[PDB]
Structure formats: structure tokens, C-alpha cells
């Protein structure tokens, strides 16, 4: 057994292809050796070494012992790999890093940082007598007995969470203690406050050890709730302040609305008012508020200005994950364009403080951002999409664009840029002038058959590379790469028409716009692009482009996508390079309103090109004086507030819209041009009415020797080939308290047989990225999970996959890691937290209810509605239960009215048992509030079943024995309520 592996290792000890044998021998009980080798893209020798070591390793692993397996991993794991720099401990930031003038004697007092650390203070004196390294003095900040608690990132409302913690006793002698919890209103605990924070049960920690701590809680309210933990000992008392983040059920969905304020109609029609209506979505999670933020910035570039200059973050594309070098460049895009605006237009007086220091700060952030991509550069000055992966023609072109633009304000290394450009034109430019991709990275999915898709992708890549080379040409203006630019421009000129998509047509038009703008074929391409223009209004208020050609699809999209904004952006930049000022104003209005709170758009490419369009346009047109009186108020509610916007302040902070009324943003006679964006955040219970561009399936399994299996497959659009998707993202939300095995995920990306190209775990999400998801068959990520802490009433999680550059091509699915049913009953006490905020059915045929208590509860000013219904259908949707009922007799209506004998929907949290409703039975239901939805073309009302919702069973006949008397008093109340009007 040892020799059978010594031969293997000895065979590949100094082999050229050595890693392929290593990760070939790695365990994969889900795929055969040939299936794993089918993904290898490093050549035949790597495939044969991989296949050999895979087969031999699989034969030796038959009927092994754990010692034999581990010893084999010792032989393989040492001789073949090299090393990797990593550290197991974190070291806090140093401090006291200052210089002082010491007049022979100087004392300075401060406060030691909050940490358990042996600090080392070092002084170095400099004077005309030389240097003096003083004796290093030690200062050990140490705590002998202390409590720490592990609070999860988020917790879904209604879940019963076990909060684990530990008390540490480093003293050599054991001791007594007790930890108590601080009761906050929204956090329901099984015990009850004594005096108001829990109880002290005295326990003992043994000397030089620890003791476990557990606190079971159940959050009833959404939001961030403070919880304190007190550790008491015969030597003192410590308070540990903590915060629990409670998240709603269901999926978060985010919609955006944009409005441009032009009070004097300088760039178009006058625009002084706009009304953002309050509309409740269909599947809104009950008892959750519809959030929406309002951002009113000063200029077309004002949103990006606020994004960069306000340092509370911030990424304009937080919904897209990091991992690709494209993300590292996009990190420096906004700072770059802000700097370009401030410097080219000389608008440094916007700062009320010293402008030179602000230009300094932005220059530094620009440089630091520019270093972020250095990791993705290879030795030959090429760039790889994925760190350690193969060099990409595409990403090298993009890096040459960003670097070439940044070089204007922060000079870039000319020799490096030269070597990169030469890497492009010397290797991956064909005779016909087009460029080819080296790696398997597919940034975009295009239409047509395999040959037609090949032509389209060739045109797109050539135009993209041309843009990069043009943007970085002045750094290294070589005749060789200018000749290359001539050949590529010729390819674009001859092969663009006839067009196959408005997208490739637009990017080709912009790439050619960066060169000779007098060539006749370029003018023909510009005409064909103008022919595809869509307009809103006549005379047009808006002008935009759909990425599909008209002759292939005549339908007009109702909402924007990333391809829409990217095509429109390429066309806008092409028109700006042509100085076509009559044509761009509706495009600028459309791109400005399609912008998003934060400054970004849908994906990365559309974002950068749209930012360049808005910024270049803002520098090309006259800067108007800014002076408006902007009033935001609700229609049928009080005025929210108003501010006077001037050039002094116009990047004002956002404002949350809490009230459930329609918003109205208005301004009087004004000078300037402001932007008003509203971001609506809701939480929905379903995803059925959303278009799914992926077949999804996900399960948890028990394994031999719990594991998540998440499979996706691409659904090709019309005229799309079966080759599969482009750059894809598999985002797996983990349930509360479920933790993923990071070793399995490493094993799926680190190898030559990698299934995924990058992975990360962020905020309870397992985010994997991928070059392509197949159309022919399913692709599955498989990784083990374990239970970190106990969770009762576990809320389901989400499984989302989407194209990185087309987030609109997505599919979201709910899943749970727990099989747990049944939910029959809660049995007595240890109960009040689950049944806390939902309804309790009255006692069946209970005659003690005294008809006046049935009227006073109905006439309560808190109780909005109150009437008698008959249930028609039961339904269980995800985490809630819907009851279809018929509205029989109306007894009260405070708010909106519903028609008699119309269909009324009820909803209760599935995790509520004592409100069990039987289909076909009548009930008297009285409660607070409702939801008014617009379904089909008519209204619909949905009523949640919570606490203070009085429900009672109501038989129709009178053969219930003594319930004859029951219905008598019931009909007594029913008769008295409507004849009075309390």
C-alpha cells in the first residue's frame, strides 16, 4: 500500500504536470474520473496525468482503513504541492504611532484599547546626537474571567434561536457565577423578567477552563433589537452589549423609480412635480412594512458624487458578488468618474473645506483602488478573470480601458501597459483583424446558431478589445498596435452589417467612433443604429434602445435591463463622439432616470458605460446655476419636509418614507437640474409569478462516509443555442444556524477539475461563480452542512442563480434544510412565544360569552373591521396559510369597504395552531387592518389573523343542542351592532 503510492509520487515528483495528478487523486464520490477530466482545459498531458492518478487512487481506496486513507493523503499531500502563505491568528492594528517633541521630559496619558493583548511599546529617539532605541516596555491587557456570546448575523422573525456563549476562567481556582439576559420588548423569552432582566442561577466554572451558556429566545418584531448579557461573579459584574438582527420572512425584492427635475425645461419639457404612488405588492409578507428610501441629488452626476464623497460605504452594485477582476476595476470606476468631473470642469469649490485636501484624498483612493487589480495580473502582463486562472483577452481589454482612463490623473506604469497591449496584439489577433479569447470565460450569451453565435461573439470581442486599446493607446502609442487598430477597425467595418443584435451593433458603433469618424461604413452603421431607436412621446421625451433587433422582436420592454442600459449607453457615447447634441437629450433623460439610488445600474458594463455617458455629457454642456425649493409631502397626510437646493449643498442625505401614503415631490420656479430616485424594498412570500430563466432543484441528503445538493440548468431564450449560459452566479442562502463546510467548497474550485470558478461565504450566503451553466443537463454544487446552534420553527431560505451580466435572467426558489412536520400543537406552556402574535379561536359553542363583551370588543376603536364570513377553501403557501372565505354580513367598516358576498382572503402564520379553521364552516372574525391589492383589473382585500383578532365558530342551523341559546345571544349582538352605530 505504501509502495503502491510511493511509485505514484515518485512518478510525478518533478513532473511538468504535477498538480493535475494531485487533485486527480482527490476524492469525488459523485463524478467518475472521465467526467472530472472532461472539465480540464490545460491540455492532454494534464488530462492523462489527472486520469491516471484519479483511477489509481480510486482503486486503492477500495476497502481502505482510515489510517490508510490518511497516510495516503500524507504521501500525496507533501511531495507534490509546494506551499501557500497563510496565517491562523489575527493581529490587531497597532497604535501610539506618533512622533513627539520631548523637552527632556514629556508625559502623555491615554486609554488602552479594548482587547486581550500583550502590547509592546517601543520608542526611538532622534536628535543631533544620533538615534536611541529605548528599551521596549511591555503592557499586558488581560482579563481572567470573562463572558462572550455568539450572536448570528441574522434571524428570521418567529424562529426560536438558541444563543450560545462561553464564560472563560483563566484563574487556577474555580469559581461561582451567573449570567442573566436583558429582556427587550420584541424579544420573547420563555421565562419572565424578575427585576427587568432574567434570573441568576449560580453555576461554577472549574479552574483554567470554561463553561457553556445558552439562552433560548424568539424574536417577535423585525429590525435590530439590543440584548444585554450580564456576567456576575463574587469579584464583579460585566455587561456585554449585543444586537440581534431580525429579518422578515420570504424574499427581499427591490424596485426602483426615477424622476428628473427640470423646472425651466432647458434640456426638454418642463418637469416640476411627480407623484410616487404607494402600491402594495401581491404576495407581500403580512405584518411587514413596505420600505422605501428617497434620494434627491443635485446634478446628473450628483448620485455618483454622493456615492464617492459620502464614505459610509459604498458599492453601487452590492447585489453583485466580488471575485472577478471586473469587480476590482468596477471598484475604481465611480471614484475615477467623480475625479474626472471635478478636475475637467474645475468644480472643486463644491467642498466647503479646503479643496486641495479633498483632491488629495480622491487621488489616494483612486490609486489604492487601482492597486486592487494587480493581483489578477500575470507575469506576462496579461490579466486573468479569476485569480490564478487563465489569462483573458476580454478582461485584459477591460483593464486596459480602466487603466488607460485613470492614467490621465494618476500616471500608470508605461512599460507595463506596453507589455499588456503587446500581449493582446501579438498573440490573440487573427489575420482578419478580429480578436479571439484565450480563456473559457464567457461574459455574454448571444443569439443565433453555433456559427452565427460565433460571428456575433467575434464581433463583440473585437469591438471590446478595440475600446480598451483606444482608451489606453496614448500611454504607449506604438505603430505596431496602431496597425493592429487599423486591421481591427477594418474587420468591424466589413462585418458589422448586416446586424444580428442591437447590442453588438451599438458596441461596434462606439468602438469605431473612437477612431476615424469619416469612414462611410461607420456612418452607415450609425444610421442603422439610429433606425433601431425607441422613443417615449412624440415629440420624444425619452429615447432608448432595446438590445434585440426590430425585425427579430417588435415588442417594447416595460422595464429596463442591463443590456438595455448598456446598448443605450454605447449609442449615447457614439453620439457624443459625433457631437450630435440634438439627439442625446432624451437619451440622457432616459439613462438618468434608469439610474439607481447609489449611482449604479443593473450590472457592471452597463454601469460603467452609462456613468461615462452621464459624466461626459455633464462636462460637455453648460453648467447651470442650481437653486430650487424642493418640497416632498404626502398626498393625504402631512408634509414630509422640504429643502432649498443650491450649489452650496446638493448631495443631501436620503430620507426614509415611513407613512403608507402616496409621495409627492414638487418644486417651484427653479434653476438647475435635480434627480429624484425612490428605492422600494418589499418582502414577498412567493416567486411563481416571476420569469425563471433556470430550472432549479435543491435538496439536503444524509451521507455515508447532512449535505446540500443544489442543481441549476439554463433555459435558453428564443434563438439562443444550447451551449449554455454566460458568467453565472449560484447564491445559496443558508438557513439560520446552518453552517457550510468550507473544505468541500474549496475542493470544488481549487482543482484543475474545478466545477466552479470562485466561492465565498458572506452574511449567511454561499456565493459561487461560474463560467457557464449548461442547457443540456443539470449542474450541481454539493457541500456538507452542520447545525451550528438549535433553531425551532426554522424559516425557509432561498436559492438564486442568475447571469452576472444579465441579472434579469434569474430564477429564485425557496428551500428548507429541515424536514420538520408536524405542527399539531404546542402543549400548554413554553408556548406563549409561538402563539404570541397570532389569533386564538374561541371555545366552540361557548355560551358564557356575554353578548355585551361581544359588542364592546366590536365597538373598540382599535378594531378596524368586524363581520361574519364563511370559509370556502384552505391553502398552504410557504410559511403562511391562506383561507378563502365569503363575506356574508358586514358589521363594521372603519377603513376601505368590501362588497357583500365578495371573496375575502385571510392569512395566518403557519406556526399557529389554536386558530385552526375548517373549510365550509362559518366564523365571526373581527380584527385590525387589511391589505388592498390590485389583482387582474379589480381590488382584493387580505386580512391577517394576529393577536386581538376575535374569531368564533358559528353554526348556521339550530340542532347544536344548547347552542340554540348560543346563536340566540350571537344574533342578539349581530342585531344590536348595526342598529346603533357606536
Amino acid at each position: 500500500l505504501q509502495k503502491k503510492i510511493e511509485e505514484i509520487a515518485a512518478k510525478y515528483k518533478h513532473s511538468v504536470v504535477k498538480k493535475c495528478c494531485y487533485d486527480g487523486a482527490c476524492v469525488n464520490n459523485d463524478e467518475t474520473c472521465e467526467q472530472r477530466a472532461a472539465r480540464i482545459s490545460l491540455g492532454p498531458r494534464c488530462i492523462k496525468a489527472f486520469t491516471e492518478c484519479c483511477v489509481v487512487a480510486s482503486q486503492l481506496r477500495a476497502n481502505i482503513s482510515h489510517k490508510d486513507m490518511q497516510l495516503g493523503r500524507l504521501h500525496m499531500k507533501t511531495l507534490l504541492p509546494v506551499s501557500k502563505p497563510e496565517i491562523r491568528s489575527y493581529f490587531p492594528e497597532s497604535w501610539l504611532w506618533e512622533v513627539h517633541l520631548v523637552p527632556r521630559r514629556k508625559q502623555l496619558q491615554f486609554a488602552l484599547p479594548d482587547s486581550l493583548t500583550t502590547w509592546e511599546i517601543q520608542g526611538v529617539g532622534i536628535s543631533n546626537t544620533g538615534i536611541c532605541v529605548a528599551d521596549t516596555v511591555k503592557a499586558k491587557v488581560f482579563k481572567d474571567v470573562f463572558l462572550e456570546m455568539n450572536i448570528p448575523y441574522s434571524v428570521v422573525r418567529g424562529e426560536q434561536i438558541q444563543l450560545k456563549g462561553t464564560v472563560y476562567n483563566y484563574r487556577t481556582s474555580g469559581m461561582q457565577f451567573c449570567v442573566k439576559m436583558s429582556a427587550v420588548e420584541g424579544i420573547c423569552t420563555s421565562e419572565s423578567p424578575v427585576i427587568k432582566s432574567s434570573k441568576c442561577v449560580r453555576q461554577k466554572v472549574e479552574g483554567s477552563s470554561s463553561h457553556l451558556v445558552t439562552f433560548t429566545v424568539l424574536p417577535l418584531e423585525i429590525g435590530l433589537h439590543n440584548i444585554n448579557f450580564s456576567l456576575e461573579t463574587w469579584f464583579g459584574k460585566e455587561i456585554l452589549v449585543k444586537t440581534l438582527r431580525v429579518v422578515p420572512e420570504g424574499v427581499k425584492r427591490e424596485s426602483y423609480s426615477g424622476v428628473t427635475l427640470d423646472p425651466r425645461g432647458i434640456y426638454g419639457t418642463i418637469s416640476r412635480r411627480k407623484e410616487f404612488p404607494y402600491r402594495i405588492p401581491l404576495d407581500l409578507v403580512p405584518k411587514t412594512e413596505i420600505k422605501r428610501i428617497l434620494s434627491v441629488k443635485g446634478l446628473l452626476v450628483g448620485e455618483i458624487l454622493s456615492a464617492v464623497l459620502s464614505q459610509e460605504g459604498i458599492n453601487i452594485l452590492t447585489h453583485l458578488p466580488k471575485g472577478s477582476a471586473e469587480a476590482e476595476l468596477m471598484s475604481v470606476v465611480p471614484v475615477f468618474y467623480v475625479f474626472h468631473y471635478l478636475e475637467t470642469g474645475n468644480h472643486w469649490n463644491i467642498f466647503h473645506s479646503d479643496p486641495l485636501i479633498e483632491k488629495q484624498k480622491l487621488k489616494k483612493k483612486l490609486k489604492e483602488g487601482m492597486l486592487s487589480i494587480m493581483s489578477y495580473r500575470n507575469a506576462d502582463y496579461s490579466y486573468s478573470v479569476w485569480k490564478g486562472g487563465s489569462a483573458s483577452t476580454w478582461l485584459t481589454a477591460f483593464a486596459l480601458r480602466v487603466l488607460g482612463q485613470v492614467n490621465k490623473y494618476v500616471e500608470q506604469n508605461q512599460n507595463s501597459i506596453c507589455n499588456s497591449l503587446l500581449w493582446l496584439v501579438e498573440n490573440y489577433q487573427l489575420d482578419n483583424g478580429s480578436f479571439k479569447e484565450n480563456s473559457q470565460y464567457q461574459p455574454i450569451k448571444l443569439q443565433g446558431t453555433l456559427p452565427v453565435e460565433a460571428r456575433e461573439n467575434s464581433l463583440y470581442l473585437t469591438a471590446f478589445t478595440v475600446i480598451g486599446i483606444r482608451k489606453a493607446f496614448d500611454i504607449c502609442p506604438l505603430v505596431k498596435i496602431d496597425t493592429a487598430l487599423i486591421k481591427a477597425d477594418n474587420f468591424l467595418l466589413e462585418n458589422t452589417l448586416p446586424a444580428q443584435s442591437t447590442f453588438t451593433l451599438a458596441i461596434s458603433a462606439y468602438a469605431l467612433s473612437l477612431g476615424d469618424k469619416t469612414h462611410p461604413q461607420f456612418r452607415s452603421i450609425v444610421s442603422a443604429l439610429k433606425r433601431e431607436a425607441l422613443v417615449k412621446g412624440n415629440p420624444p421625451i425619452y429615447r432608448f434602445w432595446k438590445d434585440n433587433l426590430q425585425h427579430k422582436d417588435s415588442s417594447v420592454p416595460n422595464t429596463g435591463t442591463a443590456r438595455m442600459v448598456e446598448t443605450t449607453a454605447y449609442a449615447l457615447l457614439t453620439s457624443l463622439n459625433l457631437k450630435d447634441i440634438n439627439y442625446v437629450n432624451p437619451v440622457i433623460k432616459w439613462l438618468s432616470e434608469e439610474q439607481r439610488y447609489g449611482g449604479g445600474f443593473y450590472s457592471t458594463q452597463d454601469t460603467i458605460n452609462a456613468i461615462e455617458g452621464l459624466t461626459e455629457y455633464s462636462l460637455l454642456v453648460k453648467q447651470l446655476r442650481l437653486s430650487m425649493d424642493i418640497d416632498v409631502s404626502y398626498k393625504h397626510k402631512g408634509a414630509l419636509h422640504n429643502y432649498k437646493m443650491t450649489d452650496k449643498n446638493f448631495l443631501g442625505r436620503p430620507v426614509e418614507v415611513l407613512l403608507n401614503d402616496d409621495l409627492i415631490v414638487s418644486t417651484g420656479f427653479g434653476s438647475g437640474l435635480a434627480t429624484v430616485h425612490v428605492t422600494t424594498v418589499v418582502h414577498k412570500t412567493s416567486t411563481s409569478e416571476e420569469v425563471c430563466s433556470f430550472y432549479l432543484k435543491i435538496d439536503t441528503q444524509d451521507i455515508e462516509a447532512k449535505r446540500i445538493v443544489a442543481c441549476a440548468s439554463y433555459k435558453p431564450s428564443r434563438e439562443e443555442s444550447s451551449s449554455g449560459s454566460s458568467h453565472a452566479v449560484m447564491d445559496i442562502s443558508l438557513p439560520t444556524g446552518i453552517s457550510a463546510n468550507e473544505e468541500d467548497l474549496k475542493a470544488l474550485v481549487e482543482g484543475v477539475d474545478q466545477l466552479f470558478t470562485d466561492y465565498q461565504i458572506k452574511d449567511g450566503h454561499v456565493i459561487l461563480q461560474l463560467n457557464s451553466i449548461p442547457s443540456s443537463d443539470f449542474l450541481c454544487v454539493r457541500f456538507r452542512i452542520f447545525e451550528l446552534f438549535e433553531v425551532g420553527f426554522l424559516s425557509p431560505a432561498t436559492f438564486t442563480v442568475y447571469e452576472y451580466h444579465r441579472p434579469d435572467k434569474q430564477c429564485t426558489m425557496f428551500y428548507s434544510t429541515s424536514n420538520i412536520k408536524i405542527q399539531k400543537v404546542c402543549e400548554g406552556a413554553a408556548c406563549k412565544c409561538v402563539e404570541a402574535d397570532c389569533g386564538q379561536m374561541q371555545e366552540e359553542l361557548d355560551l358564557t360569552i356575554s353578548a355585551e363583551t361581544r359588542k364592546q370588543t366590536a365597538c373598540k376603536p382599535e378594531i378596524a373591521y368586524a363581520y361574519k364570513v364563511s370559509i370556502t377553501s384552505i391553502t398552504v403557501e410557504n410559511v403562511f396559510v391562506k383561507y378563502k372565505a365569503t363575506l356574508l354580513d358586514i358589521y363594521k367598516t372603519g377603513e376601505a369597504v368590501a362588497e357583500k358576498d365578495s371573496e375575502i382572503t385571510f392569512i395566518k402564520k403557519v406556526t399557529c395552531t389554536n386558530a385552526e379553521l375548517v373549510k365550509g364552516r362559518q366564523y365571526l372574525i373581527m380584527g385590525k387592518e387589511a391589505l388592498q391589492i390590485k389583482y387582474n383589473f379589480s381590488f382584493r382585500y387580505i386580512y391577517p389573523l394576529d393577536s386581538l383578532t376575535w374569531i368564533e365558530y358559528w353554526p348556521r342551523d339550530t340542532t347544536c343542542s344548547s347552542c340554540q341559546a348560543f346563536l340566540a345571544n350571537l344574533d342578539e349582538f349581530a342585531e344590536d351592532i348595526f342598529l346603533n352605530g357606536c
Binding site: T269, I270, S271, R272, R273, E275, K530, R531, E532, A533, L534, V535, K536, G537, N538, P539, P540, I541, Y542, R543, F544, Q550, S554, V556, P557, N558, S666, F937
Partner: protein, 148 residues
């Protein structure tokens, strides 16, 4: 440019995208044309009739009135309560992105409608040519340029 002959013969239901899209009034010879007038389907196609919700703006107040359309080929008989209005779609773009209506009265007015989502610019321009031909020098109103 191109040729503006589109959608022959003219069908009103086809000109209305079979009741799946909303249309906005962009040109009208009616001096009392409502500001920001947008028509959207308010129901399904039952028999030859079709519910149509009409939104518009008076001053700074938004208003909506329900109407019913009776479609007969190219002719449309719109009505609300007792008020009736006879119209005939006299031109419809090739992709049904815009159309030109002719409303009947002593001085028959001509209107131009287009998809609220937008339309192909060449087809929108063709509809504009047709309306300018029919109006024949009369003053045109632009209800969508009223700060909508």
C-alpha cells in the same frame, strides 16, 4: 424615410395591442385635450366590448374615469354612462406601436396615440406624418408635454 404604409387593413383591436398595453395621447387637434391622457385596459375582452380606464391630469390633481369601448373592425364606440364618443382608427403603425384616431363631430378632430412603453422611432414618425396630413395645418396639442 422608408414607406409609412403599415397595418392594412386597420383593426382597432390590433391597433390597441389586443388590449395588452397602455397608450398615451401625444398629439391632438382638440383644444380641450386632457393633459397627460393615458388609456389602459381595465378588463378582459368580452364580446365586442372592452373596459378601458382613462387616466389624466387636471392642474396638479390626477384623475381616472372608467369607459367602455365597443369595437367594430376599425371603428370604436367609446362610452361612459350617458356620454358617447365615436372614433375610427384611420392609421396604425406596422408593429402597432402608434396609431392615428379620427374622432367624429362637427369639426372632426384627429389624435395620435402611442405605446406608453415607447415605440420604434421610425413608426412613431410615420404616425406623426399621418396626423400632420389629416390635421392639415390645424393647431396641435401635446398632452404628454404637460409635466406628466
Amino acid at each position: 424615410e422608408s414607406d409609412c404604409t403599415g397595418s392594412e387593413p386597420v383593426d382597432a383591436f390590433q391597433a390597441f395591442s389586443e388590449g395588452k398595453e397602455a397608450y398615451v395621447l401625444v398629439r391632438s387637434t382638440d383644444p380641450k385635450a386632457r393633459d397627460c391622457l393615458k388609456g389602459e385596459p381595465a378588463g378582459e375582452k368580452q364580446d365586442n366590448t372592452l373596459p378601458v380606464m382613462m387616466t389624466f391630469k387636471q392642474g396638479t390633481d390626477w384623475a381616472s374615469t372608467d369607459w367602455t369601448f365597443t369595437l367594430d373592425g376599425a371603428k370604436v364606440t367609446a362610452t361612459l354612462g350617458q356620454l358617447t364618443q365615436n372614433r375610427e382608427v384611420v392609421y396604425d403603425s406596422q408593429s402597432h406601436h402608434c396609431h392615428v384616431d379620427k374622432v367624429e363631430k362637427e369639426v372632426p378632430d384627429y389624435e395620435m396615440w402611442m405605446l406608453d412603453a415607447g415605440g420604434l422611432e421610425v413608426e412613431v414618425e410615420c404616425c406623426r406624418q399621418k396626423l400632420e396630413e389629416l390635421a392639415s395645418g390645424r393647431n396641435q396639442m401635446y398632452p404628454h408635454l404637460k409635466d406628466c
